[PDB]
């Protein structure tokens, strides 16, 4: 039971972060932070400076 819950659990958190980055890219920060790869449910990566 633990393996299935942990996964789903570790996937909803990742989505939360990608959404936030996209939202920030609009309003305040803007074209200074970029996403380079988001395969869903596994990982993401951000670029800066």
């Amino acid at each position: 039971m633990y393996n299935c819950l942990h996964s789903f659990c570790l996937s909803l958190q990742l989505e939360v972060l990608h959404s936030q980055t996209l939202m920030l890219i609009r309003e305040r920060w803007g074209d200074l932070v970029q996403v380079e790869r988001y395969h869903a449910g596994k990982c993401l990566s951000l670029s800066v400076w």
């Binding site: 789903f8 996937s11 989505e15 869903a40």
Partner: peptide
């Protein structure tokens, strides 16, 4: 005598869950 329009994502995770964890009955 309501939906906050985020089911366009959580649904996908569930599908990824079901596609990866088939019921055992």
């Amino acid at each position: 005598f309501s939906s906050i329009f985020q089911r366009q994502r959580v649904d996908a995770l569930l599908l990824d869950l079901r596609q990866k964890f088939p019921p055992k009955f």
